[PDB]
């Protein structure tokens, strides 16, 4: 945060610092050819079409001639495996902003990390609609908003609570 804001003192608030781009674990090449893995972010190569995505089971019933699948925005989100006649959805690998919630450096040096739009199971861990918040203890009491997190969630320093 200090490097991002170009200052050695950081005021109280939430500051977006980086991006959490999940890294691809393996490379999968499928031809009508290594083994196929699922539920992991891998580099897929389906019949010369390459990319990086999580391959999950699909509920889309493809026609026998169709091989690829596109959404509204013309991006390939479905594929048919050449070796075994099955349909797979490509969800994109998890990404989001990484924001640092801190009070003033005059008060404390404790920080909390918010991963925007990221589930907590694949990254003091609390799941919010805004994303996964690490380093803040969730409490059941309600106070006035000090540092805005989002989706009705706010953070404060008293340790950092959410």
């Amino acid at each position: 945060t200090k490097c991002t804001l170009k200052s050695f003192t950081v005021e109280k608030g939430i500051y977006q610092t980086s991006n959490f781009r999940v890294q691809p674990t393996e490379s999968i090449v499928r031809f009508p050819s290594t083994n196929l893995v699922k539920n992991k972010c891998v580099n897929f190569n389906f019949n010369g079409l390459t990319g990086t995505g999580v391959l999950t089971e699909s509920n889309k019933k493809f026609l026998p001639f169709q091989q690829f699948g596109r959404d509204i925005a013309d991006t390939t989100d479905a594929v048919r495996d050449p070796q075994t006649l099955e349909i797979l959805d490509i969800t994109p690998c998890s990404f989001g902003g990484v924001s640092v919630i801190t009070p003033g450096t005059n008060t404390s040096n404790q920080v909390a990390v918010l991963y925007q739009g990221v589930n907590c199971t694949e990254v003091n861990v609390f799941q919010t609609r805004a994303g996964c918040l690490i380093g803040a203890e969730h409490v059941n009491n309600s106070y006035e908003c000090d540092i805005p997190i989002g989706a009705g969630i706010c953070a404060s320093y008293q340790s950092i609570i959410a």
């Binding site: 889309k60 019933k61 493809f62 026609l63 001639f65 169709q66 091989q67 690829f68 699948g69 596109r70 959404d71 509204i72 479905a78």
Partner: protein
């Protein structure tokens, strides 16, 4: 063997409306609940499609220019129509493509056939005399009141000859039915030869000869844009011709 047929009765070929027929899948991409615009070789909606009859004495087998693409509609019963002939000069000088479906199996050949002036098949109740340089053979599954509607679209782009097909159960007696039916792509054929003229193959009935009751329609493709509608199951159910009328535009 070739036989001249001299018992035809003179009649001009008919014309009718294409309605909303001739639509095919532009690519092999599944799409769900979306509208997609494509600029491809398509048949215009409500266009003037040429109508030919086989009835007894009409035996319509002319040789037509291929143009940029061909839509073939067949109101067929008892499977009289057996195949097609594609080429440029239809002799041994050039190389020609032959598609046939006899009583047992479907044969695709690319040879320099010495074609007959009147080639036909015969059923009792003769297409070429020679084939010198054959470069490709492909054996495939059987493709095939009028009871069956057989719709085919033939394109020759980038040396690839695309055959799109659809079978529809119909009960209309004379003209084309009014409705929507998307043609699934059937055969992508790697020929890489020039095609400018085609001729369809009929079957005679012998008991001279008798022509079975059949009717076919020939339409030509032009480059245009269509707006295709994809349902929840990925089947094309509706299309819009962007150049037909201002409402569709």
């Amino acid at each position: 063997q070739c036989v001249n047929l001299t018992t035809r009765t003179q009649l001009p070929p008919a014309y009718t409306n294409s309605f909303t027929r001739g639509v095919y899948y532009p690519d092999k991409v599944f799409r769900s609940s979306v509208l997609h615009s494509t600029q491809d070789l398509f048949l215009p909606f409500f266009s003037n499609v040429t109508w030919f009859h086989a009835i007894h004495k009409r035996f319509d087998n002319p040789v037509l220019p291929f143009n940029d693409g061909v839509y073939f509609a067949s109101t067929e019963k008892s499977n009289i129509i057996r195949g097609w002939i594609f080429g440029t000069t239809l002799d041994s000088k050039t190389q020609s493509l032959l598609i046939v479906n006899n009583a047992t199996n479907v044969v695709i050949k690319v040879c320099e056939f010495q074609f007959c002036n009147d080639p036909f098949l015969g059923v009792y109740y003769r297409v070429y005399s020679s084939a010198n340089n054959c470069t490709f053979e492909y054996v495939s599954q059987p493709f095939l009141n009028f009871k069956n509607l057989r719709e085919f679209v033939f394109k020759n782009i980038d040396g690839y000859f695309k055959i799109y097909s659809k079978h529809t159960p119909i009960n209309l007696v004379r003209d084309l039915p009014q409705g929507f039916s998307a043609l699934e792509p059937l055969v992508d054929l790697p020929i890489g030869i020039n095609i400018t003229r085609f001729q369809t193959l009929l079957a005679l009935h012998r008991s001279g000869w008798t022509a079975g009751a059949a009717a076919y329609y020939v339409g030509y493709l032009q480059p245009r844009t269509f707006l295709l509608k994809y349902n929840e199951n990925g089947t094309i159910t509706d299309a819009v011709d962007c150049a037909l009328d201002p409402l569709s535009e």
